[PDB]
Design a protein around this ligand. Structure first.
Ligand SMILES: [Cl-]
Lengths: 208, 125, 226
């Protein structure tokens, strides 16, 4: 099974070194990919620059480990990087490493949305908590229904870094039956973030 | 049938000698030639040898650094590569033709019929 | 002038069949290898198979061995992936890519040519059912900036598209990646922040498109009456 990419936060100007996870194997080739675009060959045979690739990119064979170094990060360099080997007749791509841009801490703005009346008519209630325009991506959301801490009945989704302000947005959605929703009054999501000196709670009382 | 050998990792300024072993008679061969192919680039002619004459031809980029030679007894063609540079990194292939080829098509991919599978060369610090 | 162009991707059901094409141009086809690499939503690259037509060498990842078949028509400069016994997790963008003809023979501790040219990909969507979304408003609160949006719930398969006011409103929109619910159905929200003062005046309508079920829904998002 393939995996979600790991992540590395860095500034323009930073030097970064990515180590390929080792597996008897061949020499590594390194590729770069931006979202919705085809991957591009950067480095082949551990340390040869692919034709046209800038020279800030370099590769090195540490013995048994392979590394890609970007000497000085440019804006266009924020992307996902893959290492690639072969073994017998099979080619393997490693887990992606996403290089993400560092920025000042921004606390999220939190908004809570009750389920619509039209939703209730089909037996389920969705409660949505929005964390908007924050940095860095690490946030904790805790749902409470009449002071009961929920677990296992919510799902989160997070955007990619915004092209303009380098922030993230995140949604947490609580799913309840209509019956369970109408049984309780106070609906709250509590948000912990680096940019909040203490957790922010947003509340509504059902029917106001 | 042609088989290359002698490929390997070298530092800039290093030397390698590639070998190309022919099977069967090579009497009817017009040219024996070394080619190279890097990723994202066309297979390019490096050194060609005209078998009846011994006359050699070389790409501009390798002039005076690379020498093609033959030992007819062993049924072998060699490429001696001195003063290797990063831009020399490629898979190197032996090619031959028993068909006639004009003197200046001597270094073109398609102007040749038989090939080896190639021997990779990496030049890197 | 080297180009690779994938085609043939689309909706297909488990136990159905689908054949992908990779049309090559700008090079002598019989001197190279053609590889298939796929990428599932939000996930890394996964190498799938290769063919060197001329040598008729082929190889497959265990995740697809006995299921997919690679082949090539040299006279057409085209390679093919024949996909059989399809499963949900075969859903992905399928890329074709060029390598060396004798890459396996060359593979070593010091050499790895890699895959130089890539097509832009063709999408394959495996579905068991087709189901259009229901759309609910995420109504603005009574609070400078207000947030509103709409919830796009219970569809299959991906994808859905969302615009606001027919595309006139784009500033500050966030449309979240879909998540798969326990029910096996997708859900996502699209949100936007606007001025508080604008709520009493400016009409906000989300436009939701779901091509697989051929449905469009426009849903007005306004403050709830108390
Ligand atoms: Cl080859």
């Amino acid at each position: 099974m393939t995996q979600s990419p790991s992540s590395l936060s860095a500034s323009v100007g930073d030097r970064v070194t990515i180590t390929c996870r080792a597996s008897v194997s061949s020499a590594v080739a390194w590729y770069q990919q931006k979202p919705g675009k085809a991957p591009k060959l950067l480095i082949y045979s551990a340390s040869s620059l692919y034709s046209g690739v800038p020279s800030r990119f370099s590769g090195s064979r540490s013995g048994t480990d392979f590394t890609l170094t970007i000497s000085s990060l440019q804006p266009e360099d924020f992307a996902t990087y893959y290492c690639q080997q072969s073994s017998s007749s099979l080619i393997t791509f490693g887990q992606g490493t996403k290089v993400e841009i560092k920025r000042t801490v921004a606390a999220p703005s939190v908004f809570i949305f009750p389920p619509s009346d039209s939703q209730l008519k089909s037996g389920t209630a969705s409660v949505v908590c929005l964390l908007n325009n924050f940095y860095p991506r690490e946030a904790k959301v805790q749902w409470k229904v009449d002071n009961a801490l929920q677990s296992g009945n919510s799902q989160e989704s997070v955007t990619e870094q915004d092209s303009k302000d380098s922030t993230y947005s995140l949604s947490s959605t609580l799913t309840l039956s209509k019956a369970d929703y109408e049984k309780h009054k106070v609906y709250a999501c509590e948000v912990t973030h680096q940019g909040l000196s203490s957790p922010v709670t947003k509340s509504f009382n059902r029917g106001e | 049938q042609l088989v290359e050998s002698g490929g390997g990792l070298v530092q800039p300024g290093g030397s390698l000698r590639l070998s190309c072993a022919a099977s069967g008679s090579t009497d009817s061969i017009e040219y024996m030639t070394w080619f190279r192919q890097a990723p994202g680039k066309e297979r390019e002619g490096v050194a060609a040898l005209y078998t009846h004459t011994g006359n050699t031809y070389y790409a501009d980029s390798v002039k005076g650094r690379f020498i093609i030679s033959r030992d007819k007894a062993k049924n072998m063609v060699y490429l001696q590569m001195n003063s290797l540079e990063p831009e020399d990194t490629a898979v190197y292939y032996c090619g031959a033709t028993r068909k006639y080829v004009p003197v200046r098509f001597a270094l073109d991919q398609s102007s040749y019929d038989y090939w080896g599978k190639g021997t990779p060369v990496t030049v890197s610090s | 002038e080297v180009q690779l162009v994938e085609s043939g991707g689309g909706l297909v059901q488990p136990g159905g069949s689908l054949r992908l094409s990779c049309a090559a141009s700008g090079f002598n086809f019989s001197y190279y290898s053609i590889h298939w690499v796929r990428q599932a939503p939000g996930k890394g690259l996964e190498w799938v198979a290769y063919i060197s037509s001329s040598s008729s060498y082929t190889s497959y990842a265990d995740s697809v061995k006995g299921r997919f078949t690679i082949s090539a028509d040299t006279s057409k400069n085209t390679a093919y992936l024949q996909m059989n016994s399809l499963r949900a997790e075969d859903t992905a963008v399928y890329y074709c890519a060029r390598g060396y003809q004798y890459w396996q023979y060359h593979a070593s501790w010091y050499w790895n040519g890699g895959l130089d040219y890539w097509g832009q990909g063709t999408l394959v969507t495996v579905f068991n059912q087709i189901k259009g979304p229901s759309v609910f408003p995420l109504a603005p609160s009574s609070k400078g900036t207000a947030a509103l949006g709409c919830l796009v719930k219970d569809y299959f398969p991906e994808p859905v598209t969302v615009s606001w006011n027919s595309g006139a409103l784009t500033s500050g929109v966030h449309t979240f990646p879909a998540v798969l619910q326990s029910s096996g159905l997708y859900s996502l929200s699209s949100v936007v922040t606007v001025p508080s003062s604008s709520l009493g005046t400016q009409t906000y309508i989300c436009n939701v498109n779901h091509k697989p079920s051929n449905t469009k829904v426009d849903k007005k998002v306004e403050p709830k009456s108390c």
